[PDB]
Design a protein around this ligand. Structure first.
Ligand code: ZN
Ligand code: ZN
Ligand code: ZN
Ligand code: ZN
Ligand code: ZN
Ligand code: ZN
Ligand code: ZN
Lengths: 65, 302, 577
């Protein structure tokens, strides 16, 4: 009964329980730097930019793959 | 403006309506001991997606919370209790119950997010309380730190939403007892970080009539605080800091009596520039200002 | 009619019951450790004759219920805890006015009753739950009655009838009896979810019976029809002990509580959610309440455990109805303004309201947020782009502001260098005062070190936090994170570095993998593989919390749009339905 990591964009902690669990609330993390976020938010952010949302990062966590 | 009347379907008078943080949901309470939650769709239809009995007496107010702590609500009622409700993965479950109250409970309001999950409650005997919840993931454990008495009988409370570091937490309370006396009816309580105790800061002694509702104004970058008080006429004050409890510089900026009745409720907008009053004539006015600090009118909307 | 004023007097011991005469001048009060009578006076009530004669206490001294006979003023009845019923004859010259002593009951006797017309009928029950009847002709009074339930609480005669009375039982059922047929039951039903503490009849109607329970409920029952029915449902803030009905008012009731609550409440059936009248004179628990006159709704008689007897007048009630705010208000983010008010201000025509969301204003905020340029170009083009963004929206002063900044700081026997700094600072402060925290932050970010060394550090945090909160209200996430990335203050930057790094594992060996790399240190396997493309995932990696299967962000999103099955083939309905 202790919090899980929080999204880097919406700043609200993750979690998952007629779709009771939509795709946009699934976990996601860059495998090279391990900076997580939601699904919808990250798919939104990584369209106009190319850099990790968390500050002081240098990874380009879409162009790697 | 335009009207979009909605069938609330309440057997008793509606006593409060409150909006959520994002502005998409809605909460209503009534003397029929029921609280309803309304959602809206892309088609602009307000439909109720929740209804349940919450107390054993008339329910006065209901307020929302920041959605960083989840979907949390609060309530106050005539049966001398206050409860906190939670939405879970879809009905609402009672999480706690505040019982320590000699007389009826009038108002309950939350606190700004930057200082945690706090609750303030006022009663009809004179005492006001401030609770807390140290673990934000265990909402069935509330502690009681402060307990302030304010002589007269309380009827309304309001926090200060200022998030500046230089502004100390401060809460203002006003009475609504109409006796043949002439005492002050609005008081301000600050909080000194050293003694770790709330204390009186200033009192507006120019108010000798009952007060029904008070409401601060969102700060959003200003260097002073603006307060609105609802009485036989609508009043607006301004307090500035100068340079122990802080001593302000109290002024006045408005005194309007375009209602020919007694004002009941006041409220501000999101930015903090337009007020919205409501009296016994059923007319909701709005009051803006100009660059010459003269407060004008902008609506007779009814 | 009866005349007087509200007044109180102090007794010596707490009282548990009270009774009054038909003359409405002397009140008789009984208790566990007190027994006396008082004569009511318009100036001040005075005692008439106490019943505590003789220093020797008895098992019948602790009287729980007292009743004044409705036929003769010389007869009084007492119910004791020792299962003994002691009648009193006021005409006896001796101080001990006892007339008949009777001790059939073993448990504590709860209630007693007098026949409205007959002068020799008394009906009492004990805590033993067996119902027993009485005769005052000194004949064979033994007609005891089979309750067949828990302990009896209250029994009252029907004034309209002659041989019918009510009986309530702690099991949760109310049984209506008859006295001509002592063999079989007439009427039985379940009234409350728990014990029933009172039951009264209608002084005018012949088919109205209201019973109160421990579940904070008072309901009215009708016996006219062949089936019992309920019309009224009045909710109280505490349990109800006994109910008295207002004479000459068919739609008024009076109730009192026994724990927690101490006030006296008056209710109307047509308004089952709000009280008609209520008094706060008493301090302790109100215990014995009765109407002074069977036709005068003016004066009320009441008593409590605080050893005092008080009288109240109807016009002196404190009215909460006259101190209730009838309307509500609330603003909104988009500009809407809900508003509800009493119907009459916009038997009774004012028992409702009408929600009315007065819709139709801040589209200049999100539009400017979505296209402002803050980094990625040198200063001149950044200023020009924002000037155009302001221009098309119609805001001119902002456009000249941006253009003057471009002029003020780009591409200059000249002006002194630090000439315009004060004006820049004042412009920022002025923009902050009006509440336009959107332009201040943008100018701060665009300029940077050329202005960051002139504004106090506690003000910048205020501006940044207010702007971020406003943006998060409208759900503009990318812009908010963009601000958090290039904030000028260290406090704002470290906002997104608070528990935003995950730790991963390897489901084969359960060991935790290191930070950089895609191979396992023990299995020598590739723990990250796409369930669809069967390649190595080095970048983003989606996941599921029901079966721990996932892969590339776009592959799973594309496949799962059509099918609702886990790609790995584990028969799990990922993302339910
Ligand atoms: Zn998110
Ligand atoms: Zn990375
Ligand atoms: Zn990263
Ligand atoms: Zn392994
Ligand atoms: Zn793949
Ligand atoms: Zn699976
Ligand atoms: Zn799954």
């Amino acid at each position: 009964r202790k919090p899980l990591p929080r999204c880097a964009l919406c700043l609200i902690n993750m979690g998952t329980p007629k779709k009771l669990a939509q795709f946009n609330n699934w976990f996601t993390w860059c495998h090279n730097c391990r900076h997580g976020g939601h699904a919808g938010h990250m798919l939104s952010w990584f369209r106009d930019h190319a850099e990790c949302p968390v500050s002081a990062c240098t990874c380009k966590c879409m162009q790697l793959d | 403006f335009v009207a979009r009347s909605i069938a609330a379907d309440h057997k008793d008078l509606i006593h409060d309506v409150s909006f959520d943080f994002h502005g998409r949901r809605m909460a209503t309470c009534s003397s029929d001991q029921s609280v309803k939650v309304w959602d809206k769709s892309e088609s602009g239809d307000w439909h109720c997606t929740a209804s349940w009995k919450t107390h054993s007496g008339s329910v006065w107010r209901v307020t929302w919370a920041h959605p960083e702590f989840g979907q949390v609500l609060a309530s106050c009622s005539f049966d001398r209790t206050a409860a906190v409700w939670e939405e879970i993965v879809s009905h609402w479950v009672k999480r706690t119950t505040l019982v320590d109250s000699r007389t009826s409970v009038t108002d309950v309001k939350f606190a700004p997010k930057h200082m945690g999950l706090m609750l303030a409650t006022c009663s009809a005997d004179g005492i006001v309380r401030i609770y807390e919840a140290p673990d934000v993931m265990n909402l069935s454990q509330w502690s009681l730190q402060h307990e302030i008495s304010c002589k007269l009988s309380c009827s309304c409370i309001s926090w200060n939403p200022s998030s500046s570091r230089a502004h100390s937490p401060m809460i203002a309370v006003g009475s609504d007892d109409s006796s043949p006396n002439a005492m002050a009816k609005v008081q301000i309580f600050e909080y000194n970080e050293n003694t770790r105790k709330y204390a009186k800061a200033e009192t507006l002694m120019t108010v000798t009539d009952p007060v029904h509702d008070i409401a601060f104004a969102p700060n959003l970058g200003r260097s002073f605080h603006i307060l609105a008080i609802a009485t036989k006429d609508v009043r607006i004050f301004t307090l500035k800091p100068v340079r122990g409890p802080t001593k302000f510089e109290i002024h006045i900026v408005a005194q309007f009596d375009n209602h020919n009745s007694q004002v009941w409720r006041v409220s501000w907008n999101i930015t903090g520039t337009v007020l919205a009053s409501s009296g016994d004539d059923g007319c909701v006015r709005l009051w803006k200002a100009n660059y010459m600090d003269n407060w004008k009118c902008t609506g007779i909307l009814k | 009619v009866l005349t007087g004023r509200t007044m109180h007097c102090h007794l010596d011991a707490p009282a548990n019951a009270i009774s009054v005469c038909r003359d409405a001048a002397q009140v008789v009060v009984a208790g566990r450790s007190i027994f006396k009578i008082y004569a009511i006076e318009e100036e001040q009530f005075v005692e008439k004759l106490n019943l505590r004669v003789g220093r020797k206490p008895s098992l019948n001294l602790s009287c729980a219920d007292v009743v004044w006979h409705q036929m003769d003023e010389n007869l009084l009845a007492t119910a004791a805890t020792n299962g003994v019923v002691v009648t009193w004859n006021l005409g006896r010259p001796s101080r001990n006015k006892q007339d008949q002593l009777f001790t059939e009951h073993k448990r504590t006797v709860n209630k007693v009753c007098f026949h409205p017309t007959e002068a020799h009928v008394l009906l009492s029950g004990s805590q033993d739950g067996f119902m027993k009847c009485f005769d005052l002709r000194r004949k064979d009074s033994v007609s005891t009655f089979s309750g067949q339930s828990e302990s009896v609480r209250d029994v009252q005669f029907s004034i309209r009838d002659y041989f019918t009375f009510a009986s309530t039982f702690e099991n949760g059922n109310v049984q209506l009896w008859d006295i001509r047929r002592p063999d079989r039951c007439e009427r039985m039903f379940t009234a409350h979810n728990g014990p029933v503490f009172c039951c009264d009849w209608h002084p005018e109607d012949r088919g109205w019976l209201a019973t109160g329970g421990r579940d904070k409920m008072v309901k009215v029952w009708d016996m006219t029809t062949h089936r019992a029915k309920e019309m009224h449902c009045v909710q109280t803030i505490a349990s109800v002990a006994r109910v008295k009905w207002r004479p000459e008012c068919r739609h008024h009731l009076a109730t009192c509580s026994m724990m927690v609550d101490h006030n006296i409440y008056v209710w109307d059936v047509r308004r089952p959610f709000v009280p008609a009248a209520m008094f706060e004179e008493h301090r302790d628990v109100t215990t014995g309440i009765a109407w002074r006159h069977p036709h005068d709704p003016s004066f009320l008689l009441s008593g409590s455990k605080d050893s005092s007897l008080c009288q109240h007048l109807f016009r002196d009630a404190s009215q909460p109805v006259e101190r209730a705010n009838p309307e509500g208000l609330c603003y909104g983010l988009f500009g809407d303004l809900a508003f509800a008010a009493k119907e009459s201000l916009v038997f009774a025509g004012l028992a409702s309201s009408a929600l009315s969301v007065f819709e139709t204003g801040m589209r200049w905020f999100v539009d400017t947020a979505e296209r402002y340029a803050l980094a990625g170009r040198p200063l001149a083009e950044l200023c020009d782009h924002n000037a155009k963004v302001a221009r098309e929206l119609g805001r001119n002063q902002v456009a000249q502001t941006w253009t003057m900044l471009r002029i003020i700081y780009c591409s200059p026997s000249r002006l002194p260098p630090d000439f315009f700094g004060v004006l820049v600072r004042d412009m920022l402060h002025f923009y902050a005062e009006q509440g336009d925290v959107q332009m201040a932050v943008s100018v701060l970010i665009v300029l940077g070190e050329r202005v960051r060394k002139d504004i106090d550090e506690q003000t910048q945090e205020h501006w940044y936090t207010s702007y971020i909160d406003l943006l998060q209200r409208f759900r503009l996430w990318n812009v908010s994170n963009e601000v958090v990335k290039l904030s000028t203050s260290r406090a704002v930057s470290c906002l997104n570095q608070a528990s935003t790094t995950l730790h991963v594992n390897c489901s084969h060996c359960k060991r935790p993998m290191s930070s950089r790399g895609w191979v396992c240190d023990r299995c020598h396997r590739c723990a990250s593989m796409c369930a669809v493309c069967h390649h190595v995932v080095k970048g983003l990696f989606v996941w599921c919390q029901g079966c721990s299967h996932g892969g590339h962000l776009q592959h799973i999103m594309k496949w799962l749009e059509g099918s609702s099955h886990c790609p790995a083939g584990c028969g799990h309905l990922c993302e339910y339905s």
